[PDB]
Write a protein that binds this ligand. Structure first.
Ligand SMILES: Nc1ncnc2c1ncn2[C@@H]1O[C@H](CSCC[C@H](N)C(=O)O)[C@@H](O)[C@H]1O
Ligand SMILES: [Zn+2]
Lengths: 86, 122, 114, 46, 107, 17, 216, 49, 204, 408
RNA sequence: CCGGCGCGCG
């Protein structure tokens, strides 16, 4: 949930999910309902940088629902999120 | 959390409600039920029947009616675990009565009134 | 379709089934200032970036303060005025800078105790 | 508001799930007021 | 009120009428919120910017808008001198994006 | 956050009348 | 001096009246006691008028439905329970319904005892399609809230639908002052000002007897 | 309290907002200068609140 | 499975959860007349017709019948993807359809219209079949009685059909309480059975 | 003292929208003999920015991707439906209206779809002004062989598509969508006359869509509109916004530019209507006689670049004349009046020859319209089109006369 | 207005 597809998804001759599209839970259930074996998504591992990240490779905002906004300090949030329950 | 749990904890049922094997007020609207509760006519968890004038939106088990009382004049009553539905073959009328308590009604009214008040204030 | 003018009125001709004690609640909402929270949420529905929204609001408030310094800082706040004006610019009427007072204060010197 | 009518129980898991669904449907401003009202109701019944 | 002699930061302690510390964990939270101007307030002219502390005292009494400090706080200048005592020079340079002129900031 | 991306003719010439 | 005033009034419909009232200046702790007593009096000590019993004549065979009437007997009773009345009656009186045939039966079709009025004449009772005369014998009572083949009606005597009180406190140093706010919602059979006055009178009548003395 | 409100002690509030209270005093001609306003604040006058 | 597409303008299309049931409809202003000689069952919204399975003798003459569905409500909380997605979804899962013959094929508008509860045909969605109801009559009178005073009771997932006098009608509260008492009594007996003094204990 | 001192639309029309989060601010829907329209229910005070007029949620629309592959938003077509096979066989470039018509029929057949109810307020076959419903008699009154040929080609294409895809062997779920040809023709006409194309972002996906937007197709067309459409992606809402700083009086119609820079012929081809103040209309002149562009603009107070002519008698007709009249410019060379008089006389002669080419005149066309009692909508549409062309030529003549008058 | 030591609170 919240990941951005890196490739188009097809069911037969029909496109059910396009490249550069946020993954809702309805789309995920549709993938599980049918026989979809491979899903290609954009993650922090796929971004073309280790000094910053882009909106599409990060995905949806953890708190604001929509796609993440430019200028967000996602690294500090990532560090705080893991160390907080320690 | 405890307050909400006690409020929405429903009726005592079965052997915890009747000493013997059995071989409730009807309210036009929720305001009448809460008013009766204020005047100490009913308890917080005493069962009651509430007239429903909206669509069927009560969360309940997906079960067929326990009993269908079909009259020779056409009207039939479908009795479920938590509501009663009156239907007819002559007309398109459909009456719904929900078996609930004052606590569930109070929770629903609290959330509904919060939404309506916020909408009206803006 | 022209006949003399007489014309056919368009009607629903179909059935759609989808067709009061909150006075204290609404008044309390207005008193505490939750309408401003709704307005702030509404203003951000048209902003791609919220940081840019905050920066623009701060710049507009700064311009307001520089232009008319003595009108702000008391019952009127520059940021509140900016937010009200931005809400008013959409056509939704709001009190100026969300400035409200208590009509039931029993004369000067009396301070409300929470 | 097209709210479902809960008729069984409201426990810790149910209230957490209900609030999350309210934020998605109504937003954070509406849900912030719903939380204020529900907090009073829970305190009043405890 | 009163500030430290060396760091020029507000004193510590209720008995000394000192201020509250904004530690590095508090700075992380502000960076997580993205409130870059709240952070700069508590880093320069509420703690140790001697020049900008005096102007904030004046602007707020007349209500005439607080400008950005743009200079270095006394904690950074204190660190530069200490690094100078280890035979190390630390210079802050601004490169103009217009004409690419290098500007040496006073530190 | 908020710090991202750096945050007279026609006069003295009127008709004499 | 201690004075009261109505600070808000509204009439959303004919059966929904709202009013907000004020009372100031008050001493510390007085406003809470007054509000509690007034709310209890408004909610249960005010007399209301309701239909408490219905008799179905014309031999309906005591069945669930009557031929020609769209609504069932239980539906008719539920509709009758919703009718808002006001009166000054002492004891119990009787009302009758006699509608000739097809059409809509509303509160307007009720023959009333002398002192009984009807707040809303548009309240629906039953719908008649075929021309059959319908005879219903209503029993009307006047009672407090806290108090033969004829079907009873579980009437709730609540002319005041809701009531609330709130306290505002003020002070400058050693002298304090508080203000009492009272909100009253009525079903139109009585105005919020009338409800306030009736509640005050009922409370005073409840506390008069403690000052009674007896002849020697 | 509301979800967006907090309660501040009177002493903490008067300490934190001292400059704003001085401006409010001077603006409505109730204080001659900054020193007089500070003296009024120190005396806990009823108009400071 | 048949090898032709029937015309649905002359058929009674009865839609259930698992299938759509077709019964030939003789023309009539009331549209309550059914011809059971020709029948077809299809998957929902599909024109691949098939002969339904029959578990009982079917009528040969045209009979006027009243249709009433049997099932449950599916009130679910669907996941919220888009803005303003519905908080709940309620749909009527019809699993059985009862066809009750009018007494002597009387019309609804007839002032003497009564329902014949001894003639009920049950359509099952799960099995894609149609059956006749096993009706048990308790009202005195036998074959000849006043049909205006009888009441039909359907229990056991639409399998138990019983005719009783209207006077002995059971309150909905009584039915719900009976079910609750039975289930809770069995549950309590199961819970207490694991105690080792259960055999020397009383219920009360 | 208080004591001493077009019809409203069906309330259910807005009510069905209102219960589904459709909001209209400061405007009311009105119905007339021509059709539906949106008018300001009060005086809209010009604010600093654009004002929100209406808000239509995304879930109430029927949108299809403008580019291959075809993906619908919201996805109403189930997987494996034959309607997808019918849609997917269309030509990607020119067959956009067929896909929208298929979607419209599918939605009309859907029980829970909103457009099943909203489709009852669409103009019927006898009320729609699209030329796809016009017969040969109505097309004969266009007095333009090019437009007539284009309309015949469009009708032939629509009927060929319907015949190819709605033959005998189609399943029942497809046959009931359009049992006979004119139903599909009406669907295509509605799609052509009410489709809105826009670049919308949904979530993280930005794409162009062909959209059937309820309550937004209600707005009428204008080349000087007071409203415009803005898509709000955060909550997926289409906003109708009045122009910033433009006062709107009570009862003033709400209008948007259906398509900019399109002449009356293309408007008649697509939306089935034309306007007399079209500032892009073209009259083919010989080009031998030319006037001074700068003087023509200055006399009538027409400023801005050739692509943004605007006025400070002068209307869009004068702008169209300035854009279509043969003009010469030499930076700062003034025109000598004598050649201007001869040039405008020759141009007026050409315009009068063009008017004489038409069998009838414009005033007689207006009289025929006023006396018309048993004609279809397309008949009056064609009559209005030719009359509007005649008035455009006449306005050109009058503008040339007054320009030669004010040259001294 | 500087640092060490001891005792505490969350
Ligand atoms: N300015 C205008 N003058 C005359 N007709 C117009 C017009 N703008 C749009 N139309 C017509 O309105 C249609 C667009 S849908 C607009 C509402 C429509 N009139 C109705 O009642 O449903 C087009 O087919 C076009 O023929
Ligand atoms: Zn990336």
């Amino acid at each position: 949930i919240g990941r951005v597809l890196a490739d188009d998804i097809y069911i037969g001759s029909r496109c059910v999910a396009f490249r550069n599209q946020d993954l809702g839970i309805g789309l995920v259930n549709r993938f599980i309902t049918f026989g979809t074996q491979s899903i290609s998504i954009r993650t922090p591992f796929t971004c073309r940088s280790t000094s910053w990240i882009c909106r599409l490779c990060y995905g949806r905002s953890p708190t604001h629902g929509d796609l993440v906004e430019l200028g967000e300090a996602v690294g500090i949030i990532a560090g705080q999120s893991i160390g907080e329950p320690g | 959390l405890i307050g909400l749990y006690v409020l929405t904890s429903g009726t005592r049922r079965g052997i915890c409600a009747n000493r013997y094997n059995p071989c409730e007020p009807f309210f036009c609207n929720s305001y009448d039920a809460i008013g009766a509760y204020r005047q100490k006519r009913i308890n917080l968890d005493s069962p009651l029947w509430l007239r429903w004038q909206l669509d069927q939106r009560v969360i309940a088990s997906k079960e067929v009616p326990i009993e269908v009382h079909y009259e020779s004049f056409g009207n039939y009553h479908e009795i479920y675990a938590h509501y009663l539905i009156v239907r007819s073959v002559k007309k398109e009328t459909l009456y719904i009565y929900i078996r609930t308590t004052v606590g569930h009604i109070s929770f629903y009214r609290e959330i509904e009134e919060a939404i309506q008040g916020f909408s009206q204030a803006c | 379709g022209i006949q003399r003018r007489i014309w056919r009125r368009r009607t629903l001709t179909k059935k759609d089934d989808m067709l009061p004690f909150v006075e204290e609640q609404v008044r309390k909402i207005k008193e505490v200032g939750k309408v401003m929270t709704m307005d702030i949420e509404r203003l951000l529905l048209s902003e791609d970036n919220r940081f840019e929204f905050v920066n623009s609001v701060a710049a507009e408030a700064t311009e307001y303060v520089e232009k008319n310094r003595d009108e702000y800082g008391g019952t009127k706040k520059a940021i509140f005025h900016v937010l009200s004006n931005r809400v008013n610019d959409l056509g939704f009427d709001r009190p100026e800078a969300y400035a409200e007072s208590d009509p039931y204060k029993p004369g000067p010197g009396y301070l409300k105790e929470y | 508001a097209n709210l479902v009518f809960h008729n069984k129980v409201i426990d810790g898991t149910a209230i957490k799930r209900l609030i999350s669904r309210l934020i998605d449907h109504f937003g954070m401003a509406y849900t912030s007021h719903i939380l204020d009202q529900v907090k009073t109701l829970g305190f009043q019944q405890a | 009120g009163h500030y430290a002699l060396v760091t020029q930061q507000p004193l510590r302690g209720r008995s000394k009428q000192g201020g509250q510390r904004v530690g590095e964990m508090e700075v992380w939270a502000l960076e997580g919120f993205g409130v870059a101007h709240i952070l700069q307030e508590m880093l320069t002219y509420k703690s140790d910017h001697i020049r900008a502390r005096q102007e904030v005292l004046g602007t707020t009494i007349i209500g005439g808008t607080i400008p950005k400090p743009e200079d270095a706080p006394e904690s950074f200048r204190l660190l530069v001198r200490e690094l100078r005592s280890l035979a190390l020079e630390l210079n802050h340079f601004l490169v103009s994006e217009k004409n690419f002129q290098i500007n040496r900031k006073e530190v | 956050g908020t710090g991202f991306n750096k945050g007279d003719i026609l006069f003295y010439h009127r008709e004499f009348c | 001096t201690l004075q009261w005033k109505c600070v808000e009034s509204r009439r959303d419909s004919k059966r929904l009246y709202y009013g907000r009232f004020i009372l100031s200046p008050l001493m510390k702790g007085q406003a809470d006691t007054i509000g509690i007593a007034m709310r209890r009096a408004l909610l249960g000590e005010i007399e209301g008028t309701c239909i408490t019993r219905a008799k179905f004549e014309n031999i309906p065979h005591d069945y669930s439905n009557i031929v020609g009437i769209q609504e069932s007997v239980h539906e008719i009773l539920m509709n009758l329970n919703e009718i808002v009345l006001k009166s000054n009656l002492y004891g119990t009186r009787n009302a009758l319904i006699c509608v000739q045939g097809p059409g809509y039966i509303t509160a307007r079709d009720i023959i009333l005892p002398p002192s009984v009025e009807i707040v809303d004449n548009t309240q629906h009772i039953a719908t008649l399609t075929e021309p059959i005369n319908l005879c219903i014998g209503l029993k009307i009572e006047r009672n407090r809230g806290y108090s033969d083949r004829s079907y009873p009606i579980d009437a709730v005597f609540m002319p005041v639908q809701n009531a609330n009180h709130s306290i505002h406190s003020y002070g400058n140093g050693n002298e304090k002052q508080e203000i009492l706010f009272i909100e009253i919602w009525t079903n139109g059979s009585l105005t919020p000002k009338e409800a306030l006055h009736e509640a005050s009178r009922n409370l005073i009548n409840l506390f008069i007897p403690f000052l009674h003395v007896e002849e020697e | 309290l509301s979800l967006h409100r907090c309660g501040l002690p009177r002493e903490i509030a008067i300490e934190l907002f001292q400059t704003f209270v001085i401006r409010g005093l001077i603006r409505q001609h109730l204080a001659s200068n900054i020193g007089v306003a500070k003296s009024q604040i120190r005396e806990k006058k009823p108009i400071v609140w | 499975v048949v090898d032709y597409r029937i015309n649905e303008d002359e058929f009674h299309k009865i839609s259930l959860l698992d299938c759509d049931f077709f019964i030939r409809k003789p023309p009539d202003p009331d549209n309550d007349v059914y011809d059971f000689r020709e029948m077809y069952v299809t998957p929902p919204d599909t024109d691949i017709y098939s002969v339904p399975r029959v578990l009982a003798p079917m009528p040969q003459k045209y009979i006027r019948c009243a249709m009433s569905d049997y099932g449950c409500y599916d009130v679910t909380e669907p996941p919220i993807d888009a803005p303003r997605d519905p908080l709940y979804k309620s749909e009527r899962e019809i699993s059985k359809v009862f066809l009750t013959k009018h007494y002597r094929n009387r019309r609804l508008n007839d002032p003497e219209f009564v329902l014949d509860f001894e003639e009920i045909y049950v359509i099952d969605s799960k099995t894609k079949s149609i059956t006749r109801a096993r009706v048990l009559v308790t009202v005195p009178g036998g074959r000849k009685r006043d049909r205006k005073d009888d009441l039909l009771v359907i229990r056991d997932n639409g399998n138990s059909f019983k005719i009783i006098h209207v006077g002995e009608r059971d309150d909905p509260t009584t039915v719900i309480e009976r079910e609750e008492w039975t289930k809770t009594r069995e549950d309590m007996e199961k819970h207490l059975r694991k105690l080792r003094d259960f055999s020397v204990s009383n219920w009360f | 003292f208080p004591l001493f001192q077009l019809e409203s639309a069906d309330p259910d029309f807005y009510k069905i929208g209102y219960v589904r989060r459709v909001r209209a601010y400061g405007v009311e829907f009105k119905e007339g003999p021509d059709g539906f329209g949106i008018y300001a229910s009060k005086d809209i005070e010009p604010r600093r920015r654009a004002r929100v007029i209406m808000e239509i949620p995304h879930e109430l629309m029927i949108t299809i991707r403008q580019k291959h592959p075809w993906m619908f938003f919201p996805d109403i077509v189930p997987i494996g439906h034959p309607i997808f096979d019918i849609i997917n066989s269309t030509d990607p470039e020119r067959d956009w209206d067929l896909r929208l018509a298929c979607l419209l029929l599918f939605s009309f057949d859907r029980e829970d779809h909103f457009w099943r109810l909203y489709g009852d307020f669409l103009p019927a076959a006898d009320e729609c002004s699209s030329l796809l419903l016009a017969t040969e008699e109505d097309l004969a009154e266009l007095q333009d062989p090019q437009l007539v040929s284009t309309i015949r080609q469009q009708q032939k294409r629509v009927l060929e598509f319907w015949e190819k895809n709605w033959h005998s062997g189609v399943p029942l779920k497809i046959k009931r969508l359009a049992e006979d040809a004119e139903r599909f023709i009406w669907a295509v006409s509605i799609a052509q006359t009410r489709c809105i194309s826009m670049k919308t972002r949904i979530g993280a996906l930005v794409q162009d869509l062909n959209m059937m937007i309820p309550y937004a197709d209600m707005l009428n067309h204008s080349f000087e509109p007071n409203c415009f459409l803005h898509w709000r992606p955060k909550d997926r809402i289409l906003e109708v916004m009045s122009n910033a700083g433009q006062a709107i009086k009570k009862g003033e119609e709400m209008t948007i530019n259906y398509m900019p820079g399109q002449k009356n012929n293309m408007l008649m081809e697509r939306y089935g209507f034309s306007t007399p103040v079209n500032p892009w209309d073209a009259i083919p002149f010989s080009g031998d006689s030319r006037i001074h562009l700068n003087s023509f603009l200055s006399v009538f107070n027409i400023f801005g670049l050739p692509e943004e002519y605007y006025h400070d008698f002068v209307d869009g007709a004068v702008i169209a004349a300035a854009r279509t009249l043969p003009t010469w410019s030499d930076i700062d060379l003034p025109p000598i009046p004598s050649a201007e008089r001869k040039a405008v006389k020759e141009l007026q002669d050409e315009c009068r020859k063009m008017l004489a080419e038409y069998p009838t005149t414009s005033e007689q066309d207006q009289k025929l319209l006023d006396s018309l009692s048993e004609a279809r909508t397309t008949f009056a549409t064609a009559v209005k089109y030719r009359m509007h062309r005649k008035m455009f030529i006449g306005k050109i003549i009058k503008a040339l006369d007054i320009y030669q008058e004010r040259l001294l």
